[PDB]
Amino acid sequence: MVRVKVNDRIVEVPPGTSVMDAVFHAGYDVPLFCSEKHLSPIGACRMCLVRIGLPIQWQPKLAASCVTAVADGMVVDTLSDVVREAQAGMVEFTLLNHPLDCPTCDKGGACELQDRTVEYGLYEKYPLELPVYTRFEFTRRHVDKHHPLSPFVILDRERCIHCKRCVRYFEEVPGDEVLDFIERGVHTFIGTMDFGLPSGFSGNITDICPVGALLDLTARFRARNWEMEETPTTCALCPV
Amino acid sequence: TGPILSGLDPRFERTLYAHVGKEGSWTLDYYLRHGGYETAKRVLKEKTPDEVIEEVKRSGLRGRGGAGFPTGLKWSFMPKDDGKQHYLICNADESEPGSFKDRYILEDVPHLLIEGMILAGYAIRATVGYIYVRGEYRRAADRLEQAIKEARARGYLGKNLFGTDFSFDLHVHRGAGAYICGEETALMNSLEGLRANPRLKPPFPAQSGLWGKPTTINNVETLASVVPIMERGADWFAQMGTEQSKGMKLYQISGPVKRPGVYELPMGTTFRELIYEWAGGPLEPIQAIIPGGSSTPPLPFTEEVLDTPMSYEHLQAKGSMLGTGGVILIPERVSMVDAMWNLTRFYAHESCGKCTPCREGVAGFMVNLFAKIGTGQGEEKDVENLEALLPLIEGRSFCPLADAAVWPVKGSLRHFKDQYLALAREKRPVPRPSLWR
Amino acid sequence: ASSERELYEAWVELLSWMREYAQAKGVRFEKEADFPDFIYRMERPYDLPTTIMTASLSDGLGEPFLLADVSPRHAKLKRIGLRLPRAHIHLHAHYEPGKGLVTGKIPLTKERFFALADRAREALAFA
Amino acid sequence: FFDDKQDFLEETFAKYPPEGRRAAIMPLLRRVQQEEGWIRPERIEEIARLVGTTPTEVMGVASFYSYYQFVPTGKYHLQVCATLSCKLAGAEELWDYLTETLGIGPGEVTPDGLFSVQKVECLGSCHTAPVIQVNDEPYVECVTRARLEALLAGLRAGKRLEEIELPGKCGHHVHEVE
Numbered sequence: 006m007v008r009v010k011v012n013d014r015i016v017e018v019p020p021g022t023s024v025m026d027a028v029f030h031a032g033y034d035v036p037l038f039c040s041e042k043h044l045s046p047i048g049a050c051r052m053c054l055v056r057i058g059l060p061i062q063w064q065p066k067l068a069a070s071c072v073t074a075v076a077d078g079m080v081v082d083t084l085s086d087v088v089r090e091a092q093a094g095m096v097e098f099t100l101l102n103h104p105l106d107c108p109t110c111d112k113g114g115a116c117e118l119q120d121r122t123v124e125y126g127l128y129e130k131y132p133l134e135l136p137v138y139t140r141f142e143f144t145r146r147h148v149d150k151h152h153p154l155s156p157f158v159i160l161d162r163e164r165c166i167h168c169k170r171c172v173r174y175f176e177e178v179p180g181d182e183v184l185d186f187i188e189r190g191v192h193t194f195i196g197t198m199d200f201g202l203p204s205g206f207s208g209n210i211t212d213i214c215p216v217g218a219l220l221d222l223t224a225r226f227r228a229r230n231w232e233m234e235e236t237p238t239t240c241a242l243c244p245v
Numbered sequence: 246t247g248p249i250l251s252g253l254d255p256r257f258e259r260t261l262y263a264h265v266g267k268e269g270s271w272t273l274d275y276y277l278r279h280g281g282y283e284t285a286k287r288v289l290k291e292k293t294p295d296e297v298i299e300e301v302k303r304s305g306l307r308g309r310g311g312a313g314f315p316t317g318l319k320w321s322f323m324p325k326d327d328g329k330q331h332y333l334i335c336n337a338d339e340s341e342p343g344s345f346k347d348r349y350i351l352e353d354v355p356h357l358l359i360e361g362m363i364l365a366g367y368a369i370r371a372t373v374g375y376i377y378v379r380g381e382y383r384r385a386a387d388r389l390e391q392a393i394k395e396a397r398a399r400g401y402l403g404k405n406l407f408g409t410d411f412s413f414d415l416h417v418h419r420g421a422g423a424y425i426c427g428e429e430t431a432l433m434n435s436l437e438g439l440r441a442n443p444r445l446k447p448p449f450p451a452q453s454g455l456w457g458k459p460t461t462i463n464n465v466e467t468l469a470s471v472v473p474i475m476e477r478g479a480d481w482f483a484q485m486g487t488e489q490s491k492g493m494k495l496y497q498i499s500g501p502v503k504r505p506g507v508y509e510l511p512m513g514t515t516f517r518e519l520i521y522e523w524a525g526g527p528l529e530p531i532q533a534i535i536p537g538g539s540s541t542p543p544l545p546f547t548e549e550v551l552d553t554p555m556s557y558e559h560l561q562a563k564g565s566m567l568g569t570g571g572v573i574l575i576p577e578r579v580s581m582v583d584a585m586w587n588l589t590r591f592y593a594h595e596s597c598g599k600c601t602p603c604r605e606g607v608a609g610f611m612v613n614l615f616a617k618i619g620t621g622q623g624e625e626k627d628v629e630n631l632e633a634l635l636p637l638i639e640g641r642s643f644c645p646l647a648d649a650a651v652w653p654v655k656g657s658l659r660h661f662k663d664q665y666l667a668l669a670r671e672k673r674p675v676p677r678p679s680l681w682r
Numbered sequence: 683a684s685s686e687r688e689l690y691e692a693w694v695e696l697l698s699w700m701r702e703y704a705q706a707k708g709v710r711f712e713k714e715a716d717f718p719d720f721i722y723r724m725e726r727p728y729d730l731p732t733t734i735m736t737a738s739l740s741d742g743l744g745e746p747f748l749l750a751d752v753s754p755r756h757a758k759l760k761r762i763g764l765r766l767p768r769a770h771i772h773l774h775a776h777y778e779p780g781k782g783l784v785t786g787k788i789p790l791t792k793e794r795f796f797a798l799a800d801r802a803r804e805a806l807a808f809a
Numbered sequence: 810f811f812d813d814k815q816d817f818l819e820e821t822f823a824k825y826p827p828e829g830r831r832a833a834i835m836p837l838l839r840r841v842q843q844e845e846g847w848i849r850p851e852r853i854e855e856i857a858r859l860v861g862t863t864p865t866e867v868m869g870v871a872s873f874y875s876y877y878q879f880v881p882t883g884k885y886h887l888q889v890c891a892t893l894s895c896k897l898a899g900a901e902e903l904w905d906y907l908t909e910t911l912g913i914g915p916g917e918v919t920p921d922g923l924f925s926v927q928k929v930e931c932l933g934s935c936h937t938a939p940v941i942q943v944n945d946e947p948y949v950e951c952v953t954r955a956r957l958e959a960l961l962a963g964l965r966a967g968k969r970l971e972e973i974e975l976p977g978k979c980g981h982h983v984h985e986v987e
């Protein structure tokens with residue numbers, strides 16, 4: 006198997022492994038929005054960036070660890086100042102136009118954006134200088150809000166960060182295309198002409214959306230993510 | 246004189262743009278009367294595909310879309326035999342500002358392009374090919390379909406061409422005016438019935454293109470340049486330009502000049518020759534020029550700059566690059582801030598939205614930064630921040646359009662950040678003089 | 683300058699028109715979102731006239747066809763905006779003194795907005 | 810819409826592989842645009858049913874390009890190029906004068922019923938700037954105030970673009986500026 010090195014660690018890993026899996030299998034960490042388990046990785050959020058050497062032969066531009074294959078004897082750097090500064094910058098770009106709904110957002114604590122923001126954002130700039138959070142002091146993007154797409158799912162087009170998870174899933178897993186973007190640029194937004202949301206497996210996007218865009222109407226405004234008492238069990242509605 | 250072509254030396258032979266504008270040049274009869282389709286006849290029955298590929302490989306013919314990759318080696322990357330159907334893609338999406346050169350090739354000399362596409366299809370075993378034209382070129386599209394119909398009637402596109410075991414056919418597909426759809430991997434999405442969000446480059450279209458077939462995409466100027474190469478020598482082609490820039494190039498110029506337009510000139514002519522001998526010299530004092538297209542970084546108006554040979558190497562060593570040879574003159578009467586303003590707003594209009602940096606920063610932040618600066622609102626803070634912003638976008642995007650936005654701004658700062666500071670520290674809007682009549 | 687004030691005032695005025703249309707064609711109007719600087723202002727004092735920032739006209743299917751927004755209280759480059767979803771149509775109005783509410787240089791009167799919303803209803807609304 | 814024309818559908822679907830029917834979304838949509846002036850949802854549903862795909866994908870596609878209009882436009886949809894070259898030739902003042910005279914927004918239509926406005930990026934004729942396009946047709950190039958107002962007075966009286974007297978010279982591939 007192929008030998009990879011992450012910042013202090015050497016890992017055996019099968020050849021077809023993505024660099025991201027080699028980082029995490031190596032025990033390091035990297036932001037993650039565009040990619041998902043069982044979904045085709047495509048470099049979209051540009052969060053998964055690492056440094057890659059393949060001889061010390063450092064790459065010119067940052068490598069997308071979500072769509073990078075791994076080669077034997079590669080050096081992966083996730084702790085260099087450049088990588089951390091770039092990840093914080095991309096978080097800044099992503100939260101740029103976000104609707105300021107966290108306290109009243111149904112996603113609350115179990116929101117990947119919140120966690121990766123507090124994880125990687127605001128690189129240590131060098132004093133005890135009075136810090137500034139956001140540079141964006143302009144008018145934010147405002148689109149349609151709290152729109153029920155279906156008797157189970159509600160849609161907030163402002164919270165979408167334009168990942169591909171729901172449409173990637175919709176084409177891949179059920180094979181039922183009842184969702185895709187409409188326009189382009191920053192005006193891009195999610196919509197449908199199939200209104201009943203006919204596919205019998207739509208609910209999973211509720212869990213996948215790294216933001217609170219698509220939320221469960223049957224569980225909207227009941228309790229907070231940490232507040233619910235979890236009971237892991239097995240469903241007996243059908244024999245699977 | 247020692248054999249080297251760098252300008253107006255009298256041994257230059259117009260090949261592509263010769264018949265442009267001549268009335269009835271779009272008739273197949275015109276093309277035939279000047280020796281057309283002879284090169285297809287000779288190559289199809291004499292040469293093998295590897296031979297016509299080696300021919301263009303030795304021609305030094307580099308990609309005419311702006312890339313510069315040897316189309317010979319490019320075709321050498323193809324499977325070159327697999328049993329599957331292959332496709333040849335004509336990229337007729339011309340969307341870079343200041344670029345109007347291929348338009349009239351498509352309008353007035355189509356059968357040159359058709360012969361070149363037949364040559365490339367013979368080279369790469371392409372039996373069917375598609376021509377993707379932008380939704381703003383209707384005259385060229387009409388003339389192209391007319392030419393294809395004529396060739397189909399007189400037996401130039403058929404089951405078996407000229408007795409040999411090769412086949413070829415072309416099909417036109419009109420676009421709807423989207424700059425990103427010109428991207429070679431996004432064009433295939435747009436045609437295929439998808440939204441034009443680019444594809445992964447590590448799989449190249451030579452190995453996976455339209456509908457999974459091994460397609461090859463070449464620029465219109467490249468396909469047209471194939472025909473003379475096969476016609477009269479590859480060395481004759483390589484007779485023009487420096488050691489890394491062989492052949493001729495279709496330069497075009499726009500701006501406050503006496504007679505802007507197109508000139509089929511060798512690679513390496515000085516900017517002074519182009520603007521002054523040909524375009525008649527500027528009409529107003531120019532503060533800078535954008536050589537390649539719009540995506541290229543501006544360079545100052547200097548004598549040591551005016552002497553620069555327009556090539557794939559001399560501009561490389563000066564910081565800018567030769568995208569299309571489409572020069573635009575920026576005068577002192579218009580602020581650089583306003584020029585890059587319009588550039589960034591244009592690139593914001595045309596982003597696909599996949600990459601966070603391009604979509605968000607460019608369409609929301611960068612354009613807003615330029616607006617605040619040049620509308621009499623900015624402060625030095627915005628210029629510092631925008632200065633730091635570009636390296637956060639350049640390195641990491643799925644398609645280089647994002648880099649296409651920062652490099653012109655990047656250089657615009659490295660030579661004219663001072664200007665912005667003025668408009669920052671004066672809190673002055675960009676000057677708005679009356680320019681049109 | 684101080685034009686901002688009247689703009690927000692003018693913005694409130696705009697909302698009235700929207701609501702009126704709702705009763706005219708019997709079409710659903712919805713308050714989309716209120717000001718954050720009014721929810722999250724805890725003790726801080728608040729002088730703005732209304733609390734609503736974003737609203738829309740939704741068709742029978744609930745999908746909006748017309749959107750209107752106003753700039754927040756502390757943001758740079760303040761404006762009022764209109765958008766037709768799915769139609770790639772954006773309008774950006776200011777308030778010029780003496781003239782009134784104007785889209786750039788062209789006045790934005792009640793009749794213009796009524797016609798625009800009626801065109802959206804006839805064309806874009808699915809049901 | 811495409812019910813009437815099945816020969817055209819056969820011709821378009823023969824241009825693409827039997828599995829690549831979806832490519833046909835591009836031409837079919839276009840045929841609607843120039844025929845009816847704007848794209849209705851029914852057109853999109855019909856394109857999907859004919860081509861064997863979901864209306865959602867087709868709508869996303871159609872809204873991806875700037876040319877495809879989904880609201881009514883005037884009989885003469887004046888597409889104004891606003892790019893660098895055309896601005897340097899006065900697309901700012903041209904656009905300002907045009908819109909202020911006609912009194913329209915880019916989303917709405919003149920009450921006369923034949924004039925709509927829209928900004929467009931590079932029309933690929935830069936030396937002859939400024940440039941304007943009328944809904945599908947070869948550009949009216951070298952647009953000066955006289956050229957614009959004459960084109961307007963002609964179109965107002967029902968003159969076909971092919972038959973309108975345009976003052977001034979517009980070069981083919983080069984053009985003399987004086």
Ligand SMILES: NC(=O)C1=CN([C@@H]2O[C@H](COP(=O)(O)OP(=O)(O)OC[C@H]3O[C@@H](n4cnc5c(N)ncnc54)[C@H](O)[C@@H]3O)[C@@H](O)[C@H]2O)C=CC1
Nearest residue numbers: 310311312314322339340341344429449538540568569645
């Ligand atoms: N309208 C216009 O004329 C415009 C022109 N441009 C110019 O065009 C350029 C865009 O060209 P790109 O598509 O980025 O080309 P590129 O430089 O990335 O690659 C050139 C060609 O060779 C192939 N290639 C490169 N490396 C390869 C490898 N190792 N193995 C196999 N194949 C390989 C690529 O697939 C491509 O077809 C811009 O950088 C700019 O200069 C850009 C925008 C608009």
Ligand SMILES: Cc1cc2nc3c(=O)[nH]c(=O)nc-3n(C[C@H](O)[C@H](O)[C@H](O)COP(=O)(O)O)c2cc1C
Nearest residue numbers: 308309310336338339340427428462463464467646
């Ligand atoms: C974002 C993007 C946009 C592009 N737009 C164009 C274009 O409008 N016209 C063009 O000829 N090439 C364009 N290209 C370059 C393509 O690579 C080009 O079709 C291809 O290089 C043709 O190959 P050739 O130059 O070897 O003949 C674009 C590339 C990118 C990345």
Ligand code: SF4
Nearest residue numbers: 106107110116216217
């Ligand atoms: S999606 Fe996440 S970051 Fe955004 S408002 Fe909801 S909890 Fe906050």
Ligand code: SF4
Nearest residue numbers: 165166168170171214
């Ligand atoms: S709605 Fe959610 S899952 Fe879908 S693209 Fe947006 S962020 Fe991703």
Ligand code: SF4
Nearest residue numbers: 597599600603644647
């Ligand atoms: S740089 Fe990224 S977001 Fe921008 S057009 Fe290219 S792929 Fe789309």
Ligand code: FES
Nearest residue numbers: 039050051053071
């Ligand atoms: S994680 Fe690789 S770009 Fe989204």
Ligand code: FES
Nearest residue numbers: 890895932933934
């Ligand atoms: S700039 Fe308007 S046509 Fe190229």
